[PDB]
Scaffold this active site. Sequence first.
Site: not given
Lengths: 7, 329
Positions: B44, B47-49, B52, B67, B155
């Site tokens: 999907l 990101g940086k972390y 997904v 995740k 966030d």
Amino acid sequence: XDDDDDK
Amino acid sequence: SGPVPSRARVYTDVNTHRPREYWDYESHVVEWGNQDDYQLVRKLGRGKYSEVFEAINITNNEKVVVKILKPVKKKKIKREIKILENLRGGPNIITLADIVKDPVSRTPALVFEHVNNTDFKQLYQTLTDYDIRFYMYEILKALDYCHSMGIMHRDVKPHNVMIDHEHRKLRLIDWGLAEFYHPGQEYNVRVASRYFKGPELLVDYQMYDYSLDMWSLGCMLASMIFRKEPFFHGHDNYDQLVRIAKVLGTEDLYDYIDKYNIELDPRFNDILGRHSRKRWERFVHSENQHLVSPEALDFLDKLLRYDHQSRLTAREAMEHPYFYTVVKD
Ligand SMILES: *C(=O)CCCCCCCn1cnc2c(Br)c(Br)c(Br)c(Br)c21
């Protein structure tokens, strides 16, 4: 995102 | 000399009355599942972390979201997991169904309940005045719960709010930045996305609290009722504060930093300027008039305030007349 964390 | 300390006005001392196990996530022992129970269907995003994926639990044939965390400090993975377990079952909190060890990345993979989410860019164009109030109340249930459990989300933004509009289902997701609130603790100001950073982050005030989430929710509300996504569209973190100051005015900004004995970054000297507070009706026009009401503007006004101590708490916000027309349950 668009920033980053550690605390 | 130095900044003036600050405390949350609600849920201040909740963590010191819990046992050490509740908030000391470094010592949390992760109970692992079986990664073979899940087959990855499609990616999907990433990101940086993390990365997904949509996946399927092969046993019960149910859809899930996985995740896969990128390598980071064990305490940060444990922080996200411990917060997800503490909040599991709460109103509109995404449910952490399982935790497995990904065989390729060798890092933890979090399995979440699936939500038939429609992307917010398409969805927000179709939300009525009633829908905005309904979903805002649903978000507030999640924020009040986690604040009452001693946890800041840090966030809040549309991409972290999964909405199945067909079934009126809402979940607050991505707790990777969430922290436990301990009074007097100085936190990392590098949290949240640029457009939803509270002024406390933008001026480098580290002793913030749950009220950060309320500013970010105010940003979401302003973007929905004015049909301007995002509302404060800064080009960087410094221009982001300028964007806020052009609507809220520089006078209240200086009162804010003066109350807490904060000194602004001197690079704001030549960019910040002098701005009066704007009346909200300047952002109303024919295309968003049907989403704007006296109640919506008073509510937004009590959320988008420089002084974090002056914003509505989540519990107060749910008492606002803006939600009188919403059927509950
Ligand atoms: C910053 O770097 C943001 C990168 C965001 C990538 C988000 C992808 C979508 N996503 C992430 N977690 C999700 C969960 Br949990 C569920 Br449940 C769902 Br339905 C989705 Br689309 C998720």
